Amino acid sequence: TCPFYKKIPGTGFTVDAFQYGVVEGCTAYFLTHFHSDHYAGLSKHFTFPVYCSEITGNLLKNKLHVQEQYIHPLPLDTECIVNGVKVVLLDANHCPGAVMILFYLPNGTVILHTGDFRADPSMERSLLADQKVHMLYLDTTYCSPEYTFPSQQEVIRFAINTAFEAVTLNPHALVVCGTYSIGKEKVFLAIADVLGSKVGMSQEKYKTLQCLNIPEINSLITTDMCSSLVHLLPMMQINFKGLQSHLKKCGGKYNQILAFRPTGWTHSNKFTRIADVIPQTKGNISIYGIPYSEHSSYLEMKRFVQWLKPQKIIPTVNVGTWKSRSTMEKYFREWKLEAGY
Template identity: 40%
Template sequence: MWSEDRVTGSNAFHHSVPGASSFTVDNFHVRNSVVKHYILSHFHADHYAGLRKKFNSGKIYCTPVTARLVKLKIGVSADHLVAVAYHSPLLIEGTRVTFLPANHCPGSALILFETPDGKCHLHTGDFRFHPKFSEDPVLSSFTSTGSRKIDHLFLDTTYCSPEHEFPAQEDAIRFVGELVKSNAFANRETLFLVGSYTIGKEEVFLQAARESGCKLYVHPAKKKVLECLELKEEDQQRLTTVAHEARLHVVPMGCINFKQMSAYLGMAKGKYKTVVGIRPTGWTFSGGPRQERGPLVIYGVPYSEHSSFSEIRSMVK
C-alpha cells in the first residue's frame, strides 16, 4: 500500500504514466485536477485503497471482472466504470491503453500505455510470471528478440529477493488436488477447509473440488464474488451455500489455525473426526509445511500469485 499518497494526494511517479499526465494507476488518493483517467490493475485492497462509492472524479478503467467486483463490493456507479477486455486497445486522449492477463487474481491486468510521444510504459500491477507470457502477442514484441522496447517498467517487486523461490502454480494445485482426492475417498469423516481471500487462490479450491468430485461450500457473500469471475459452468455447479452438503469448505485464510479448526470440528457435532486445513500462500509458513495437533492437520502450500525472484528477472529480460 502506498501510504504516502494518502498524505500528499499526489500522482507519484510509481502511479503515473510519463507523457500522459491525466492518467493514474492504482491510485485513488490523488488530489490533482489534471487526473481524469483512473486505471485499476486488479481488485485487491492495496490497489483500490481510497476508492469510495461516491467516486465521481473521472472514469475508472479496468477489466470486466474487476468492474463487476468494484460495483458489487464498493458500489461505484456503472457510469464511472469502463470495462476493457484483455487485448482490446482503447485510445484515450491519444494514449493507447491495452490490458493484458497478469496471472495474479481473476481480472488482474498488466497495462501497456503507448503515449503520444511514441513511448511505451508497462505497469504490471501485481503479477505471477508464467512462461506463456512469451506467447502473448503484445508482450512478445518487447522481448530481447522483439522489435520494441519498454521505456518505463513499473514492476511488482513483492518477492524481489533471491530467497523467494517457490514451485510452479500447477505443481501446488496438483498437490492440493491429490491430497483432497486421496483423503476424500479413504476417509469420509474428514472435513477440508481451504483458505482464500476475497479474490485470489480460486484455482486451489476449484481444482480440489474437480479432482475429488466433492461439492464446495462457500459463504453466500463469497458466492456473489465468485459469480463475478466468469467461472466455467461445471465449476459453478459444484458450489453450494449449504454447509452440510459439502466436505470441502472455502473459508477466510485467517480461519486456517488450530483454534478455528477445532471450533469447526465442534460445530460438526460428530459428523467429522478430522479437519484438514489448507493454507495456500506465497509467504513462508512459520510452522513448516505440515502441522498436526490431534484430529487437526494444517498444510501450508506454497501457492503464490506473485512472481518469485527468478521470475521477476525473467519478466525484466
C-alpha cells in the same frame, strides 16, 4: 499525496491511486486488479472515470457499489483509445481480472505497468513481442534470489493427492481451505473436483465468486454448507482453535479436519521440497501451509525483464526502505550487464 511511481508521465493518468483524494491533473484512474491495497478509497461516491478489466468492473459494481456510469471496462488484447492515448490491457497471471497496462505515449515513448503479476514465458508471445518498451513499472514483491517456490501445477498436484488420500482413508474427514481476497481459486476448486463435491462458503464469498466469469461456476460452488465436504473459511480462522470450533458446528457429520493455508513464500521454502511438506497436527486437526504464489519468483522476474530489455525500471513494491531500494537496483544492474542491453 500520490507517490510518483503511481503517475504516468505525459498523460492525465494514474494507476492504483484511489486513497489520495482528487489527484491534481488526473483525468482517468486505472485499477489493475481487485485487491484492497490497490482499490483502497473506491466506493459508491466515486465520480471519476475508472478504467479496468470486465471482471474488475463486475466487482466494483457489486461489491463496492460504484455506479455504472463511471465504470469503463476494456477487453483484453485490444488497442483502445482513452482520452486521446492508445492503451492495451494484458493478462497479468495474478488473480481473476488482473491486468498489465501498455501505454503508447503521444511523444513515441512506450510504458508497461505490470500491476501485480506472475511472469511467465507465455507473455513473450503476447502483444509485447511487437514493439520496444522504454519504461517498466515492475511488481518487485519477491525481487531477491532467496525467493524460490514451485510451479502452481506442482502445488495443485500435491494438494489434490493429499486431500484424495485423506478422505479415501477416512470418508468422515472434512477439508477446509483459507481465503481473504480473490485469487488462488484453483486450490479449493481442484480439491472439490477430485472429491466429487461442491465447495461450500458464506453468502459474501459466494457473491464475490459469482462476479469472476469462471466457466460452469454454478456447478462448482454453493452456500449449502451441509451438502459440501470442502468448506471455505476466512484465513484468520485457519488455526487449531478456529477449526475445532468449526468442527463443533457440523453436528457430528465429521470427525477429522484436513486444512490448507495457501501462503506466498515462507522461509520453509529455503530448505524443503514440495514433495517433503508436512502439516502441523493437534489431535484430529492437520494444517498444511502450501507455497501457492500469484507473484513472480526471482528467476521468473529476471527472465521476463532480460527478455523485455527496458531502458528504465521503476519498482512498485518494497519501495519504502533504503536497503530494499539499493538491493533491487543492484539486481537490475546485474541483469542488464549479463544480458548486454
